[PDB]
Amino acid sequence: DEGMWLMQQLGRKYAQMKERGLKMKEYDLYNPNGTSLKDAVVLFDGGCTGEVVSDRGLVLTNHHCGYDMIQAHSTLEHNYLENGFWAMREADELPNKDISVVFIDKIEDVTDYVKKELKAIKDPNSMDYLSPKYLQKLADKKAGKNFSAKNPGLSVEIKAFYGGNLYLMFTKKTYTDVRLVGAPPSSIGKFGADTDNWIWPRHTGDFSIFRIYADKNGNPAPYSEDNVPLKPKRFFNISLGGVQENDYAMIMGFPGTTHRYFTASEVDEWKSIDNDIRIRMRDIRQGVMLREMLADPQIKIMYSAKYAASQNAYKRAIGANWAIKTRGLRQNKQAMQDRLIAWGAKQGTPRYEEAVHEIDATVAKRADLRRRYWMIEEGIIRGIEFARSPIPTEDETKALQDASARKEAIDKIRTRYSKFANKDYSAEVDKKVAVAMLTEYLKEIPYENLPLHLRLVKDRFAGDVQAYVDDIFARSVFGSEAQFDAFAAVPSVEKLAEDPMVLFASSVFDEYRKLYNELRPYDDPILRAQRTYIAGLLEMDGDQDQFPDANLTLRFTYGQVKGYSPRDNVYYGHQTTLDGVMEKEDPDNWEFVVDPKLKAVYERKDFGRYADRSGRMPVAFCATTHTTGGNSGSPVMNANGELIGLNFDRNWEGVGGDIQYLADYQRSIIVDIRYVLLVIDKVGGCQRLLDEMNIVP
Amino acid sequence: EGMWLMQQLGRKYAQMKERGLKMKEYDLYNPNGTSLKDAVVLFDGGCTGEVVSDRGLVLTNHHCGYDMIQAHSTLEHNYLENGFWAMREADELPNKDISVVFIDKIEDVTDYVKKELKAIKDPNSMDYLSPKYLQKLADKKAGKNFSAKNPGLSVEIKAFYGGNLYLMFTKKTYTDVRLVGAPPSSIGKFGADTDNWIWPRHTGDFSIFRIYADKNGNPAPYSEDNVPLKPKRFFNISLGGVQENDYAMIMGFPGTTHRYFTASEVDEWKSIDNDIRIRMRDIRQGVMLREMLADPQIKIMYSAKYAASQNAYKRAIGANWAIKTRGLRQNKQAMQDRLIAWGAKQGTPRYEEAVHEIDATVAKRADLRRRYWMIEEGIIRGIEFARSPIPTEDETKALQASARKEAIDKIRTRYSKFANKDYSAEVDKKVAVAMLTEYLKEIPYENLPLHLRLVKDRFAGDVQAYVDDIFARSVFGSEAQFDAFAAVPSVEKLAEDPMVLFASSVFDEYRKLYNELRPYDDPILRAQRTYIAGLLEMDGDQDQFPDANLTLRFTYGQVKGYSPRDNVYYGHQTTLDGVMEKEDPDNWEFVVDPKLKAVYERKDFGRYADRSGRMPVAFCATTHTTGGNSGSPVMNANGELIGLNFDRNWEGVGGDIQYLADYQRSIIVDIRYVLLVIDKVGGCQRLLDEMNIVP
Numbered sequence A: 001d002e003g004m005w006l007m008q009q010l011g012r013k014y015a016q017m018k019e020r021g022l023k024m025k026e027y028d029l030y031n032p033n034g035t036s037l038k039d040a041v042v043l044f045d046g047g048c049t050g051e052v053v054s055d056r057g058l059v060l061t062n063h064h065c066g067y068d069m070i071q072a073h074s075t076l077e078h079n080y081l082e083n084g085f086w087a088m089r090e091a092d093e094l095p096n097k098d099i100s101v102v103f104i105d106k107i108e109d110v111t112d113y114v115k116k117e118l119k120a121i122k123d124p125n126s127m128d129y130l131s132p133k134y135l136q137k138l139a140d141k142k143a144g145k146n147f148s149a150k151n152p153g154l155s156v157e158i159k160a161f162y163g164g165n166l167y168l169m170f171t172k173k174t175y176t177d178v179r180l181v182g183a184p185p186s187s188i189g190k191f192g193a194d195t196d197n198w199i200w201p202r203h204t205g206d207f208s209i210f211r212i213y214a215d216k217n218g219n220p221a222p223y224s225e226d227n228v229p230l231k232p233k234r235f236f237n238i239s240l241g242g243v244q245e246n247d248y249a250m251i252m253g254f255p256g257t258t259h260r261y262f263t264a265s266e267v268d269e270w271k272s273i274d275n276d277i278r279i280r281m282r283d284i285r286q287g288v289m290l291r292e293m294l295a296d297p298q299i300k301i302m303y304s305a306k307y308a309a310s311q312n313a314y315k316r317a318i319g320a321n322w323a324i325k326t327r328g329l330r331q332n333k334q335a336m337q338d339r340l341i342a343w344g345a346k347q348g349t350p351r352y353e354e355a356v357h358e359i360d361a362t363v364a365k366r367a368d369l370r371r372r373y374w375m376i377e378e379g380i381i382r383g384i385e386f387a388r389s390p391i392p393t394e395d396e397t398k399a400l401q402d403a404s405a406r407k408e409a410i411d412k413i414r415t416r417y418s419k420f421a422n423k424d425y426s427a428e429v430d431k432k433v434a435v436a437m438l439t440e441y442l443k444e445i446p447y448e449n450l451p452l453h454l455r456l457v458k459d460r461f462a463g464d465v466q467a468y469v470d471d472i473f474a475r476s477v478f479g480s481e482a483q484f485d486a487f488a489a490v491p492s493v494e495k496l497a498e499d500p501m502v503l504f505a506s507s508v509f510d511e512y513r514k515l516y517n518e519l520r521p522y523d524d525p526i527l528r529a530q531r532t533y534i535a536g537l538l539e540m541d542g543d544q545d546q547f548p549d550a551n552l553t554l555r556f557t558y559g560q561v562k563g564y565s566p567r568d569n570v571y572y573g574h575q576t577t578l579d580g581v582m583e584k585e586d587p588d589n590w591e592f593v594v595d596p597k598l599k600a601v602y603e604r605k606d607f608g609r610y611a612d613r614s615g616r617m618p619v620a621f622c623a624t625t626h627t628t629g630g631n632s633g634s635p636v637m638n639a640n641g642e643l644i645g646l647n648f649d650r651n652w653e654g655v656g657g658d659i660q661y662l663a664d665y666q667r668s669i670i671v672d673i674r675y676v677l678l679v680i681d682k683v684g685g686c687q688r689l690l691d692e693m694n695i696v697p
Numbered sequence B: 001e002g003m004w005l006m007q008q009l010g011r012k013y014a015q016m017k018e019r020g021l022k023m024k025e026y027d028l029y030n031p032n033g034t035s036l037k038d039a040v041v042l043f044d045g046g047c048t049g050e051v052v053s054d055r056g057l058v059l060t061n062h063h064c065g066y067d068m069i070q071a072h073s074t075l076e077h078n079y080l081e082n083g084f085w086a087m088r089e090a091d092e093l094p095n096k097d098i099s100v101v102f103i104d105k106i107e108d109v110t111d112y113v114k115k116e117l118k119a120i121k122d123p124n125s126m127d128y129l130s131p132k133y134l135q136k137l138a139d140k141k142a143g144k145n146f147s148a149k150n151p152g153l154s155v156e157i158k159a160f161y162g163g164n165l166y167l168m169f170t171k172k173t174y175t176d177v178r179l180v181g182a183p184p185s186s187i188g189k190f191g192a193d194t195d196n197w198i199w200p201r202h203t204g205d206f207s208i209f210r211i212y213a214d215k216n217g218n219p220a221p222y223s224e225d226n227v228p229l230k231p232k233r234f235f236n237i238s239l240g241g242v243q244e245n246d247y248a249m250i251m252g253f254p255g256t257t258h259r260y261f262t263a264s265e266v267d268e269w270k271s272i273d274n275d276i277r278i279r280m281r282d283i284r285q286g287v288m289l290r291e292m293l294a295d296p297q298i299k300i301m302y303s304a305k306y307a308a309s310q311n312a313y314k315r316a317i318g319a320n321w322a323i324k325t326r327g328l329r330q331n332k333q334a335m336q337d338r339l340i341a342w343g344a345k346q347g348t349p350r351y352e353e354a355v356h357e358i359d360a361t362v363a364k365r366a367d368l369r370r371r372y373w374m375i376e377e378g379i380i381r382g383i384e385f386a387r388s389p390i391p392t393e394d395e396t397k398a399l400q401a402s403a404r405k406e407a408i409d410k411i412r413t414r415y416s417k418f419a420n421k422d423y424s425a426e427v428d429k430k431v432a433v434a435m436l437t438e439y440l441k442e443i444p445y446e447n448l449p450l451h452l453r454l455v456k457d458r459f460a461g462d463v464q465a466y467v468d469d470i471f472a473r474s475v476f477g478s479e480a481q482f483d484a485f486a487a488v489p490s491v492e493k494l495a496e497d498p499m500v501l502f503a504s505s506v507f508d509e510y511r512k513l514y515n516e517l518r519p520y521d522d523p524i525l526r527a528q529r530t531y532i533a534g535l536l537e538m539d540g541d542q543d544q545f546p547d548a549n550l551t552l553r554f555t556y557g558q559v560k561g562y563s564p565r566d567n568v569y570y571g572h573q574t575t576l577d578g579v580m581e582k583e584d585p586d587n588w589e590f591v592v593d594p595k596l597k598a599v600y601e602r603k604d605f606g607r608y609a610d611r612s613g614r615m616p617v618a619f620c621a622t623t624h625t626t627g628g629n630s631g632s633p634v635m636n637a638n639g640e641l642i643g644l645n646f647d648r649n650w651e652g653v654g655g656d657i658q659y660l661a662d663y664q665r666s667i668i669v670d671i672r673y674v675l676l677v678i679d680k681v682g683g684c685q686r687l688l689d690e691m692n693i694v695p
């Protein structure tokens, strides 16, 4: 609804944005033929968003965006992840291998060009109109002969939008020398740890600082000691004016994916198959893991990360199913498609109703296969660790059935066994997880649809799941270290070909691949019908109040700084403060430890020019902007285009926003720039970073 | 902020009028005439209730009438789960051992008691607080045969302000109080125990009774000839509802507070009482929860025991949060230092001496009090086999006349009660192993109950082995072990039984600690009499109320929500929409009554919904309440009934030591929601018709 607009759509949205509080001139925010604020936005490390905040190429992004770089530069002597990092001179900024920042130099509507090229149709059902290989061939053709060589640092890309009804060509400028400049300690950068993920109120200072480096002429260059900071076309001014309830706020970033044009049948499928299976299977897996972690402190250490990784999409699916149940998402897709069908009937064009029918019939046809795919993926592929135990290759088997190739094959198998049964793997915890997961899977998947090895539960073990799992470990070469070593001393192909763990792993991966192959053909009639469906929606109501689905491209969104009521008699305001961090402090809980330097700043009220009018220290705020994954680190702007914060999350009540924007619940969770500037100053003591920024009072 | 005496209404009236009170002083409390005070009752010796009709109809909480509803419930007519609605007065169910107490008169007898106390002789006598001594003074003042000359009336004298003020209450008690109506448990106890101490709250916590009496309105025990009581005063029910900032007031019987604690008593309450209860109950509850989640039959057997342990655990967490965050210790320290500075200026050192005595007694009893709380929380309430059977002297002098079979039957009856349908020996062994491991880490060998010395001496520190041996060798370790004993019972076997020796040993230590600690209460009580007298002489009895002591008090405030934490606000009112948001069909605690769900869907709210068409459920207020205030009437600026108090938020449990203006709230069921349930759920229109409802 309130969307993720293309840069091209700024002209037709400008009057609405000005009516809502925007004060800056249109072309100062985005101009296709000149420097604008869009030039200060980057795609950071291929997923996150970032922003240039100085004339020396300083870049701000989230702490979770720069986490890998902070961890790669951390040692037991200098633990930057735990204590933070603050380069006191430019020469101290740490280079990062395999990093990139992408500027969106130009954006061009190439729809007529692509549609003309597509007319050279050999097959009307061809999926080349969505093919990245085909679209790249069109981009190179339009850009010219050896474009990347004639314009170093530049590259061109064509993307489909609106289901193949609009195409844009992006000219990108990529920098690969991007150095670590500063980061708060993890106690600030990830304060709520996984407890506060998807949660508002939020008290996390989710930021990290980098710097773009380039050759002497500002042109992209890989890491070199001779590289100099980039002087950019444009950078953001930092506002110290803060935010008030109802203030206009806007964001630019790279949202990843949305499903705004789902039919009501696709919403039902998402709920009843995807979400219900993920919820059910992860609840079983997590329940067993938690019981084992709570009983043995060593199991808690080994399984804490695996448990946290399972919980993230579990929480997302709970949040998504809450919107489907309470916000009428299915009903609103049903009303949208019925309105298009009625309009098509009145215009004498039945192709829109035919397209919606095709989608519904494909969804109904693939239901059993999709249910079987999600059951095996959630239940076994992800659910059971020994499903990813070693499977001897075609060549490895041959190199065991008269040369030194046997010791080579055994070394490869040993390396894979040592990765599977690593320092964090408990065979006992895995057997208990497998028994509960397989019991549920065997109740849901009939005998005829089981992976072949799982048929032994009924046929060989009289339905005893525990005995079938016990037998896998008791007899397998990968059941324990002593069992592997006995095999490694006298390795026979006959033993491997009949190994219960190998047969289980092979069998479950066989079924998983077979289901994937049988389901893949159903995606194409839905995609082709969506091209017709979205064309109808656009022709009927226009490209004014319906944005194209996110597809990892540059978008803007606007709204207001505003809280919301999550439930009866409860209101969450628009801004959190440093007092809220102190309320959450728990010294004996690593997730909620408070940095001593930050605690003393709060006690002393050493907030300087960063506190609000009442003398309170702001931490984070929330806004009615429409964001999703891909918007981590996005710049949040004032009515004047000044930086007021960095987006870092969205509340669980707004996960349904990827299908239907929720005005009364969905909020972007943003770290206040005043809190960013307080941490750099009072916790990092890195004054040179403050001095190079253009700070407006 | 206070729990004011009825006598203090005159001195508080102007402040209440400034806060919104519209009714005349003597219409609320008149010391020599009829007033709103006359419609308030002490319900069943703990709760509060209120008369709401000229035919003696009484409203109180659902938790207050819970026992009566359960006693009248059968598998055929389960009134506890389905609710109960007597469609005629003759259908109202009598209750054995029930009472309602009216506070007929209240009189200041301080000078009388103080004159009588001059005859003591021993300056450190505790007769000034003795209920037996005070009752002797009450009978003397009322007259030789007062109850015969005034049937249904009795008198009682109570101490206030640590023995610096005495009031005599003239009570009128009715013992025929019948069950009239109750919502289903899904409404009366909606959160079940999940929402206990919680605001926002969506519980319709109410139940309905009726006072019966003889033909002349005089108290009478249950009789078929009893007729409903025509009271001299009853509350009018308001349908005007509440708005944010509205004046609200309550009358009730708050049980206890500790407003005059020294800073050292606040430290002791935190570091001994609360920390031990929190630590021991977290261990006990953790083991119980693991076992209940793994076996559905264990969940059935242990759900009630687990819930009973959790209630005071949550109270202690809430209390420790106030001590840590609201500066409770610091505010008691400032109060005592202000009195000490004032006493130094006046030339009277007795106040500073009284505070020093309290601190020294607290410091002196620290180790004993820690040992007492450790054994009480850790073993007496923590381990079920601590309450296993102990053969009496009479039972032992029977096993070694042949009433050996009668002695075995008494021991068997106690064994069958201990090892009942809800007892799991396996669950108890696991709880005991974790509880004893903690207890043995905290209590040194020399301070252990004698039998627990065997963990180190006989079992090489193996707690599991010591507990396994108790069950493997005890006559109460299993049914087969008891029966083998019962067939051939010998005193030699009982006197050496590991479970009997454990149970006797832990109860011996528990009693010894209690006996050694009891003498420390007296110097603190005597010093508090001097301390409170100083505080009253220094700042007056105007902004400092006497501690609650189960007597009639009033409190006033406003209908107002609060901010529990940064960027979160809880408003002043909950709605029926919040009940529907919490509905969980496969969770017995959050099931929603189909009749109530239908009323909400069809918006069949009648004259009970607010101006916006939303159905109110509960509200909260800045009144100062505590345990004993369950079922208290909540009044308008005009004295009309707007709700019934039923709880207080966990953030306000610290309010028993220091009232918390920004956090503490009384949790009240909206009277409009009470009437909606009687009408649309119970269909008991005759109850609505007998009430005086004001638009």
Ligand SMILES: CC1CCN(Cc2c[nH]c3ccccc23)CC1
Pocket: A047, A048, A064, A065, A197, A198, A632, A648, A649
């Ligand atoms: C505040 C939330 C914390 C979790 N995070 C997922 C995530 C973990 N690591 C990342 C690196 C880059 C992009 C996303 C992620 C989303 C935001």
Ligand SMILES: CC1CCN(Cc2c[nH]c3ccccc23)CC1
Pocket: B046, B047, B063, B064, B196, B197, B630, B646, B647
């Ligand atoms: C909302 C309630 C508040 C008090 N209650 C304790 C209790 C349980 N039963 C009772 C009967 C009379 C008086 C108090 C109680 C627990 C929940």
Ligand SMILES: [Cl-]
Pocket: A348, A349, A350, A351, A352
């Ligand atoms: Cl057509």
Ligand SMILES: [Cl-]
Pocket: A327, A661, A662, A663, A664, A665
């Ligand atoms: Cl909404």
Ligand SMILES: [Cl-]
Pocket: B102, B230, B231, B232, B233
């Ligand atoms: Cl009366």
